[PDB]
Amino acid sequence: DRQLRRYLAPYSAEIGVDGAEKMALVVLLNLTLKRDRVESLCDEGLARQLLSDEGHITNCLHTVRWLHTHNLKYPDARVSGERLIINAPPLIPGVISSAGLPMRMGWAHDSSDINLAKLFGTSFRYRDDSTNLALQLVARSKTWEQALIGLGLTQQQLDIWCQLLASNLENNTFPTVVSPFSKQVRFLYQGNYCVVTPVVSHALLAQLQNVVHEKKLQCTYIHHDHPASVGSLVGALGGKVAVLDYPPPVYLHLSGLTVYDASALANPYLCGIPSLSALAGF
Amino acid sequence: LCTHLSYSRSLSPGKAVFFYKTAESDFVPLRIEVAKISGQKCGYTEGFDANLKPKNIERYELAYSNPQTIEACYVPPNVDELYCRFSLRVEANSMRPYVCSNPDVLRVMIGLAQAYQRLGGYNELARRYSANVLRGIWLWRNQYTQGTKIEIKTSLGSTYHIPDARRLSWSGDWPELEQKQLEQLTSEMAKALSQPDIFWFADVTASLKTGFCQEIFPSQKFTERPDDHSVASRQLATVECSDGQLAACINPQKIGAALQKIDDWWANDADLPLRVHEYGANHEALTALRHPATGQDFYHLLTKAEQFVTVLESSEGGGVELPGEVHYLMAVLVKGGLFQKG
Amino acid sequence: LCTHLSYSRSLSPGKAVFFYKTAESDFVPLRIEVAKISGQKCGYTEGFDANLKPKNIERYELAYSNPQTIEACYVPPNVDELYCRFSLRVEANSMRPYVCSNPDVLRVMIGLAQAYQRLGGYNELARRYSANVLRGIWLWRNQYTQGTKIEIKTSLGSTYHIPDARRLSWSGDWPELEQKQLEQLTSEMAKALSQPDIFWFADVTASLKTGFCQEIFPSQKFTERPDDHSVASRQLATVECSDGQLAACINPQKIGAALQKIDDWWANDADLPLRVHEYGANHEALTALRHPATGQDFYHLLTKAEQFVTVLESSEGGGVELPGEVHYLMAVLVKGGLFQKG
DNA sequence: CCCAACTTGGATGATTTCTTCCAGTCCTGGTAA
DNA sequence: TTACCTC
């Protein structure tokens, strides 16, 4: 049933796998193949066969190096350089942000890792918290390791992977230089100027895709060409991403000013009145 | 019965218009005027509620008038006589159904009309219609004159003249040299009703000798309650002349309702005649004389045709054999309409 | 048959307008009026249910009136005669298919029309159409007058005059000096139907001598049952003049429905003719006389064209030997339409 | 200026809602071996 | 100098 693929998608609510670790490894490994080659994600035999292919798994292990919390490529696939992994800022009472959300990661590197990336980067609910396969193996979670060895993995192959899998998550969490295709804007801060570069939050955007459809909010859709070249979520959504749409109901005194072609998209999450940061700027 | 069955209207007037003559111009229309009046506050519910305590009205509150806006019509000073005129056409159009969806019904309705024609009976209907024209009952409430003269000129070259129509009854024997004209007129019409391809016209003019400024009663319009406090509550019907002037008239179907008032075949007691109606409606008493519960209505009788043809066919004719049920049915077919969805 | 096959309409009127003359102005339109009336509660299901006990209606409940809203039209007082006029164009347009997707079908339809033309035949159709113009049957329900005069002028310089058209039959021998005009008119039209590049027009006017305020019957609109109680239940068709006045008219296809009523070729018993129709629809009896089950309809007959041409080509012609089946087919091709999807 | 403004009985019946065949492109991606 | 993929 296609509904299983829907519930494992980055834009759906997370589902529990407690006591089902054996079939969870089978389904998650089976997702690494093109849909045309798989009659079912539940075939134990296919999974046992895929698991024995060190090359296939090695190609999957390599995708871990580009898992991120914030996506520097979102608006423009041309941005080149390193990933970004940062804990959500402290909550500000007057601002909606990722500060009130739990920890989640996504994937975006060369556009050919859409299937192979699904083995380690797919999240699920476990022990009543949010986790994924890479985290349970790096943390030495015995229940998952016992099921994985039971499905045909040699103890020596697991002892090596725990190390390489962990290593891929231990460095390159902040970019070295500012990339040439990124945005830069400057304002006064503590009496002097500072350059600010915004970035889109994975956890925050993914939640919005679910809330606007469930709570029946006013919204529209933004298209992306080549979805595989922008990210996990954009690909899963078929290149169409939902945003909020809330238009207005329409001393020195400046009268009669006309503006042509103003940007109506304030931030990647909201359409409506132009960003107030721009007027302060003006 | 069957799904489709219709007859057309075989006898009909156009409308009646009032006018008078002058020494210089032969046709001057009678026209109407409009005015505001002070009425009375009176009648039940003015002072009552379900006939209990008569509300809480102070003595002075009923001494007030009730104003109203009405239309009225009077003959102007110094006109000695008023004229009224209309035209009448008659066609032999009850011999065949306008539409019928059933060949077995059709052959019978035709067989019956013919069986009836040759035994006599159109003379009977013609006598009754003719009497109503010469009596003058189509003037309705305007019959109260000092003298009424009626003249008729038909397309075949005849002329009829009733010097004074004020006293000819429905039931009785008309005075000599008038009885004679009822007989002759009956013959022209009896033919027109049953023989095809005769184009028969009548042209009826009557003269009314009136009082000094007598009030005249033309047809009223059917209107909804007004709410602008300006438009007349009661409104009269008029026609527009070739030069744009308006004149008082009586509507076509109102003239017709009078001419066809010939039905006294019920209850074996003639009384006064009713306007032919499938259920025998009586408007004065607000009731019905041929209610379906009696078996005397049109629809019960429509289904007995096979038995009527048998009787009419077996009789010799020219006698007294025609029953009330056959005459009634023929009268209804003359005022044709829709007899469908059986 | 084939996927595409069409013919155009080869004979057509514009529309007919009623008007009268005055001493000062030549064209004054006849116009319509609207009014409220008080009707009857009558007919089946007013008092019945499946012809059983006539419900639970109290005697007084059927004596009530039934009001209705209608449009109507009358000739104003003192107009001596009414005029009606329309134009007619005829084209030699049944010789060739408007569209045909099959070269083998095309050569046959051409062969047939030509085989027919040279043996005689358009004369026969022209005579039948011509008779209907001169008779006046296109006035429908307005034929009942004191005298009908018809006058025709054409683009070739001819004039025709029927002093009184009230009595000319479909079947019979017309009176002298009228029979002659029928022959002359037939000749002009026989050409109009068969030779190209003749631009033939006719202009037909008629005069009606009428009664004092006789009712007139123009075309009605096709409407749905209203529920606002404010719109008329019977609405009449009019035209707008260049000066803004409105006038009563008869629709183009209602004039045409009369002119093309020339089909008495069924059942070897002429009776009265039907409007040409691929299935022989009979509007008076609500049925169809060339039901597909009989083999007498247009589509069965169309498939034998190969055989008809053979006969026409072998026959001498010039006589009365052509069969009803060939005449029928040509009459349908004249009223062209869509004949596809075999 | 000043005083009034109306009760009542009622608002339709028949049967039908069409067809033929078509639906154009082209330039506008990163990433790896 | 070559190809490989998102409901």
Side-chain angles (χ1 to χ4, degrees):
Chain A
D1 186 349
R2 66 190 181 277
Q3 293 188 97
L4 175 58
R5 290 179 186 274
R6 181 183 66 205
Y7 282 115
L8 297 175
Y11 57 81
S12 295
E14 292 181 323
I15 61 172
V17 298
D18 293 296
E21 299 81 4
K22 180 178 179 291
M23 289 309 299
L25 290 173
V26 171
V27 170
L28 291 173
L29 183 55
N30 286 336
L31 288 173
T32 61
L33 300 178
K34 190 179 193 291
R35 289 195 297 270
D36 294 346
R37 295 174 63 191
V38 179
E39 295 179 357
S40 177
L41 293 173
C42 296
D43 185 85
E44 181 176 317
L46 177 61
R48 286 186 181 277
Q49 291 171 338
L50 288 172
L51 189 58
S52 73
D53 180 337
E54 288 180 346
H56 184 73
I57 298 300
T58 296
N59 289 340
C60 295
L61 285 168
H62 286 169
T63 66
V64 172
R65 292 169 184 162
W66 289 274
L67 294 175
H68 56 268
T69 61
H70 291 80
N71 187 0
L72 293 172
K73 297 173 74 174
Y74 171 76
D76 187 339
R78 293 182 299 171
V79 175
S80 176
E82 301 171 76
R83 65 176 171 183
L84 188 62
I85 298 173
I86 298 178
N87 295 329
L91 184 66
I92 298 170
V95 178
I96 297 171
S97 75
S98 68
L101 302 180
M103 179 62 74
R104 289 182 63 185
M105 303 186 81
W107 180 99
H109 170 45
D110 193 21
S111 64
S112 59
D113 290 345
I114 319 314
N115 301 0
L116 291 170
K118 292 177 183 177
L119 177 57
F120 294 106
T122 297
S123 70
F124 50 87
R125 183 174 183 175
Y126 192 65
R127 308 301 173 89
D128 200 27
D129 207 341
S130 294
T131 190
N132 62 45
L133 181 60
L135 291 173
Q136 292 296 308
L137 293 173
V138 169
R140 303 306 305 275
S141 180
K142 289 179 180 178
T143 300
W144 286 105
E145 293 186 7
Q146 290 170 342
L148 184 58
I149 295 297
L151 290 174
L153 184 65
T154 300
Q155 184 68 49
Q156 291 176 333
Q157 291 170 310
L158 181 58
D159 291 346
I160 293 168
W161 292 2
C162 292
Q163 294 173 76
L164 294 172
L165 180 64
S167 296
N168 286 336
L169 297 176
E170 292 174 357
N171 211 322
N172 302 322
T173 61
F174 293 85
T176 302
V177 302
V178 178
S179 182
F181 293 95
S182 65
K183 298 293 187 179
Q184 291 191 51
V185 63
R186 63 201 190 283
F187 301 94
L188 291 173
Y189 179 72
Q190 297 181 329
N192 210 324
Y193 291 101
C194 181
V195 179
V196 180
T197 295
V199 64
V200 174
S201 165
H202 176 72
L204 182 60
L205 181 59
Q207 182 182 60
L208 183 61
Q209 300 306 299
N210 186 61
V211 172
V212 299
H213 290 95
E214 292 297 308
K215 297 297 187 183
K216 315 307 178 194
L217 301 178
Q218 298 292 300
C219 63
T220 189
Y221 299 87
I222 305 300
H223 301 78
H224 298 269
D225 291 346
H226 306 291
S229 69
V230 177
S232 299
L233 181 61
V234 173
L237 295 173
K240 296 180 182 178
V241 180
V243 300
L244 296 175
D245 186 358
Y246 285 97
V250 178
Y251 290 90
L252 176 63
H253 183 200
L254 301 178
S255 174
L257 293 177
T258 297
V259 179
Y260 298 98
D261 294 321
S263 176
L265 180 62
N267 62 57
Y269 312 101
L270 172 68
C271 301
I273 296 170
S275 178
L276 294 172
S277 66
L279 187 56
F282 176 81
Chain B
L1 302 178
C2 65
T3 301
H4 299 280
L5 181 63
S6 301
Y7 281 80
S8 297
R9 182 182 65 198
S10 68
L11 185 152
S12 67
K15 62 181 70 176
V17 177
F18 289 102
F19 66 94
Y20 67 92
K21 297 178 181 295
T22 62
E24 295 184 359
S25 177
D26 196 65
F27 178 95
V28 179
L30 181 67
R31 67 177 186 266
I32 66 171
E33 66 182 30
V34 60
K36 190 171 185 177
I37 64 172
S38 295
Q40 295 183 310
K41 292 178 70 176
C42 62
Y44 193 66
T45 78
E46 187 66 30
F48 291 89
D49 184 353
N51 201 30
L52 307 175
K53 182 179 186 289
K55 304 184 178 181
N56 295 292
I57 298 169
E58 298 185 81
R59 294 183 181 277
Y60 70 82
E61 287 190 281
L62 299 178
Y64 284 120
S65 68
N66 189 9
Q68 298 287 270
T69 301
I70 59 86
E71 291 186 354
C73 182
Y74 299 91
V75 175
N78 302 330
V79 178
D80 289 341
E81 64 186 17
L82 190 67
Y83 301 93
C84 182
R85 184 158 76 97
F86 76 95
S87 65
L88 172 67
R89 297 191 295 186
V90 178
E91 296 183 356
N93 204 4
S94 64
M95 297 304 293
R96 182 186 295 271
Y98 179 61
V99 176
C100 183
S101 62
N102 185 304
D104 197 66
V105 172
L106 179 61
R107 70 186 176 87
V108 173
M109 292 304 291
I110 293 169
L112 180 58
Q114 291 182 333
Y116 183 83
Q117 188 276 330
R118 73 176 180 84
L119 302 171
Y122 275 113
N123 288 341
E124 179 63 26
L125 290 174
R127 182 183 67 82
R128 290 167 185 259
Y129 291 130
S130 297
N132 283 347
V133 173
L134 294 177
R135 284 175 68 217
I137 65 170
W138 39 272
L139 294 170
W140 291 97
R141 182 171 182 171
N142 298 279
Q143 293 178 74
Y144 201 72
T145 72
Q146 296 180 2
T148 300
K149 183 172 74 70
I150 298 175
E151 295 177 357
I152 302 174
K153 298 188 285 288
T154 68
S155 63
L156 299 177
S158 295
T159 302
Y160 305 89
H161 184 197
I162 302 299
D164 186 340
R166 284 186 294 168
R167 290 187 170 86
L168 303 174
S169 64
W170 174 247
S171 175
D173 297 297
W174 292 11
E176 194 56 272
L177 307 183
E178 296 177 0
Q179 182 70 46
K180 294 290 183 290
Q181 295 185 64
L182 183 60
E183 299 299 327
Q184 290 179 5
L185 183 58
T186 299
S187 294
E188 286 185 42
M189 191 169 291
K191 183 178 179 180
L193 288 171
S194 64
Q195 182 175 337
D197 205 34
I198 298 171
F199 298 80
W200 189 80
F201 298 78
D203 178 78
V204 180
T205 303
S207 296
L208 308 179
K209 182 175 182 290
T210 66
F212 183 74
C213 292
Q214 294 300 320
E215 186 174 355
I216 303 299
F217 302 91
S219 294
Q220 296 182 36
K221 292 184 179 178
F222 184 117
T223 65
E224 299 294 326
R225 183 181 67 83
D227 59 5
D228 67 8
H229 304 290
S230 296
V231 71
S233 181
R234 182 170 69 249
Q235 298 174 26
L236 305 175
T238 66
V239 301
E240 185 172 353
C241 297
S242 295
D243 64 350
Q245 296 187 72
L246 303 180
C249 68
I250 299 170
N251 288 334
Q253 65 278 33
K254 189 66 171 285
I255 296 298
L259 293 177
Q260 294 183 1
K261 186 174 184 177
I262 64 168
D263 181 354
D264 54 0
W265 289 290
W266 51 280
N268 298 323
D269 183 357
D271 199 68
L272 300 178
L274 302 176
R275 194 263 192 275
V276 174
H277 191 280
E278 291 83 31
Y279 295 124
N282 178 319
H283 286 287
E284 182 176 2
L286 299 179
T287 189
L289 280 304
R290 294 179 184 271
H291 189 279
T294 65
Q296 296 297 307
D297 74 8
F298 179 75
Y299 291 104
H300 278 292
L301 290 174
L302 182 59
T303 67
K304 302 280 89 185
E306 290 176 339
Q307 292 170 257
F308 289 146
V309 169
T310 299
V311 171
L312 292 174
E313 185 65 25
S314 298
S315 297
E316 292 182 354
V320 297
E321 55 275 353
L322 299 178
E325 293 79 18
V326 169
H327 285 301
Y328 175 72
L329 284 175
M330 293 306 294
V332 174
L333 292 176
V334 169
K335 173 189 77 72
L338 307 179
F339 306 123
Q340 58 175 260
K341 179 62 173 171
Chain C
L1 304 178
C2 62
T3 302
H4 300 276
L5 181 62
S6 302
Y7 281 81
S8 297
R9 182 182 65 198
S10 68
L11 186 151
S12 67
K15 62 177 66 178
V17 178
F18 288 102
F19 68 95
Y20 65 91
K21 297 177 185 294
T22 63
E24 297 182 358
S25 176
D26 194 74
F27 183 84
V28 179
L30 184 68
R31 66 189 66 196
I32 65 171
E33 63 185 64
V34 59
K36 298 183 71 68
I37 65 171
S38 175
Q40 298 175 311
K41 291 174 70 175
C42 63
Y44 194 69
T45 78
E46 187 67 32
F48 289 91
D49 188 2
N51 202 34
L52 307 176
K53 182 181 184 290
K55 304 184 180 181
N56 294 295
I57 298 170
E58 297 182 88
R59 295 176 64 186
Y60 71 83
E61 171 59 38
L62 300 178
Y64 287 118
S65 66
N66 185 8
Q68 300 285 269
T69 301
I70 63 171
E71 292 187 346
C73 182
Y74 298 91
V75 176
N78 300 314
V79 178
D80 288 341
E81 66 183 10
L82 192 66
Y83 302 94
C84 182
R85 183 159 73 99
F86 76 94
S87 64
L88 173 67
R89 292 181 295 103
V90 178
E91 292 280 332
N93 195 3
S94 63
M95 294 295 173
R96 189 182 181 96
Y98 176 57
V99 176
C100 182
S101 62
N102 184 305
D104 197 65
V105 172
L106 178 60
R107 71 186 175 88
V108 174
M109 294 305 289
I110 293 169
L112 178 59
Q114 290 181 336
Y116 180 85
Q117 189 273 325
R118 74 173 182 84
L119 302 174
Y122 278 100
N123 288 342
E124 179 61 26
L125 291 174
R127 181 185 68 83
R128 289 167 184 257
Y129 293 126
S130 297
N132 283 347
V133 173
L134 293 176
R135 284 174 69 213
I137 67 169
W138 40 272
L139 293 169
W140 292 97
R141 184 172 182 183
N142 298 281
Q143 293 179 75
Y144 198 74
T145 71
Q146 295 179 2
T148 300
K149 186 173 80 76
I150 298 173
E151 181 179 358
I152 300 174
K153 293 182 173 67
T154 68
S155 62
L156 299 177
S158 296
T159 302
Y160 307 90
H161 185 194
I162 303 300
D164 187 345
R166 285 182 295 170
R167 292 183 172 85
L168 304 174
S169 65
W170 174 244
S171 175
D173 295 299
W174 291 13
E176 193 55 286
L177 305 184
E178 298 178 5
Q179 185 71 54
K180 289 183 182 298
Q181 293 186 69
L182 180 60
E183 291 177 345
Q184 290 179 36
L185 184 59
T186 299
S187 294
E188 286 184 46
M189 192 170 292
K191 291 178 182 178
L193 291 172
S194 61
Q195 297 176 325
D197 297 341
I198 300 171
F199 297 80
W200 189 80
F201 291 80
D203 177 275
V204 180
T205 184
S207 297
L208 304 180
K209 182 176 184 292
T210 66
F212 185 66
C213 294
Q214 294 300 320
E215 187 171 352
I216 302 298
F217 304 94
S219 294
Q220 296 179 39
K221 294 182 180 178
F222 182 114
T223 67
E224 301 296 332
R225 183 179 182 272
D227 57 355
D228 65 8
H229 305 292
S230 297
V231 70
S233 295
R234 186 180 75 186
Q235 299 171 29
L236 305 176
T238 65
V239 300
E240 184 176 3
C241 299
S242 66
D243 69 10
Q245 295 185 87
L246 306 179
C249 68
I250 299 171
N251 289 332
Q253 64 273 33
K254 189 65 171 285
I255 297 298
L259 292 178
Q260 293 184 2
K261 185 175 182 179
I262 64 167
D263 182 354
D264 54 359
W265 291 297
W266 58 284
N268 303 325
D269 185 357
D271 198 69
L272 300 177
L274 285 87
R275 195 261 193 275
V276 174
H277 191 281
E278 289 85 32
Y279 297 118
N282 178 318
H283 288 286
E284 181 177 1
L286 301 179
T287 189
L289 301 180
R290 293 179 184 269
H291 190 279
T294 66
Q296 298 298 308
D297 71 11
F298 181 73
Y299 292 100
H300 275 292
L301 291 172
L302 182 58
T303 65
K304 296 182 181 179
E306 293 168 356
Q307 294 176 354
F308 287 120
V309 170
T310 299
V311 172
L312 293 172
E313 287 298 351
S314 297
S315 299
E316 295 75 2
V320 297
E321 55 277 345
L322 297 177
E325 290 173 329
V326 170
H327 285 298
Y328 174 72
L329 285 174
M330 292 306 293
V332 174
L333 292 177
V334 169
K335 172 192 77 72
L338 309 181
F339 309 126
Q340 64 180 20
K341 179 62 173 171

